[PDB]
């Protein structure tokens, strides 16, 4: 259930990060072109935080970005409700 | 319950802020290197707001950032549902 949700998320993050650097390399001045930093990007997105060090300049990138948002926000939300119950049912 | 949640959050914020400046000092051009500003960082993150004045440049930093996100979003969410009921059960 919750371990499924984390995994799903840790999938989406590893999915997006992968596709983004792929999606992005070739576009001169792309920042979002190494999996490491493409990961930070992918976390910061699914958390709905939006720092702005990093983002897609390419279309295909942003198409990634959207899935990453859609899939990753929800799947993170799960881990956010997950630990919200765990503190609820306890104290 | 709610006072537990606030505390948890005010812990996470004081946790993250601490670790971040720790995590970050040494990295030339780190911004996120004084607890005061490392705090603002840590709030702005747990609120899922993402202004972008501040963020971790270091790996270890971002590792902090993640916990801060995970722990701090949820634990803030609590204080957000907390006062959402308090206005609900009242008016």
């Amino acid at each position, epitope marked *: 259930c919750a371990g499924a949700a984390t995994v799903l998320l840790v999938i989406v993050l590893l999915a997006g990060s992968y596709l983004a650097v*792929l999606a992005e390399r070739g576009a*001169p001045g792309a920042q979002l*072109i*190494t999996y490491p930093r493409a990961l930070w990007w992918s976390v910061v997105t699914a958390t709905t935080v939006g720092y702005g060090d990093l983002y897609p300049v390419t279309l295909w990138g942003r198409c990634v970005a959207v899935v990453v948002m859609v899939a990753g926000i929800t799947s993170f939300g799960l881990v956010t409700a997950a630990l919200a119950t765990w503190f609820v049912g306890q104290c | 319950c709610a006072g537990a949640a606030t505390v948890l959050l005010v812990i996470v914020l004081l946790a993250g802020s601490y670790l971040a400046v720790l995590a970050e000092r040494g*990295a*030339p051009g780190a911004q996120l290197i004084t607890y005061p500003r490392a705090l603002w960082w840590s709030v702005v993150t747990a609120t899922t707001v993402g202004y972008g004045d501040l963020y971790p440049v270091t790996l270890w930093g971002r590792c902090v950032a993640v916990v801060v996100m995970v722990a701090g979003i949820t634990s803030f969410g609590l204080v957000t549902a907390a006062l959402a009921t308090w206005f609900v059960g009242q008016c």
Partner: antibody
Amino acid sequence: VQLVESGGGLVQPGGSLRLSCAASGYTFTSDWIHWVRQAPGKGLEWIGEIIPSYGRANYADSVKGRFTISADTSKNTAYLQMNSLRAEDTAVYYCARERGDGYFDYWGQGTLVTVSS
Amino acid sequence: DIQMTQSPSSLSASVGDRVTITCRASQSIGTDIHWYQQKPGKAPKLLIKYAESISGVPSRFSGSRSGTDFTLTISSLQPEDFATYYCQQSNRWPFTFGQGTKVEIKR
């Protein structure tokens, strides 16, 4: 883990020639093989990259869409199709593994492609 | 594109002397520059990464500083250090290398 290049010697101006980077050691799903170059007594020239996984293969404006980069995961190789060759293409051509980290961990011996009439 | 300007081209520094090689990036490139020893006829060999050290690289080789000025230093120049030294962007697409710096051992 090391990279083994094949092909390349002499062509005529406007000729064609095909370079090879056989893989040969622990090789992950998602590595880019890259192509770098050095003219007689010059610097290094990033030229291309290719994920053999989805087979998408970015090039230098400097080397245009004159050269193509081929993948073939079945031979754990990658290749540097080399059309429309110029006196300048005269150089040595190292391939290189880059794990998505953006430095070159290993380097194929590098061959000499010469171009004169 | 991004312009690593290595400095200088030529060094005639004496063995066991302190040797330092500068790479001014055109913009702030994060910490995303790597060093590469390449010896006459051989392939580049990666010395430093993230401006961090690689398995098997000699201790004399360290790489520092930030902003636009990145520095690879050879504390105590060796006889086996006669080479050309290279500099690599990663921050923006595409990657770039520095003009390169040739070291010549004096004796």
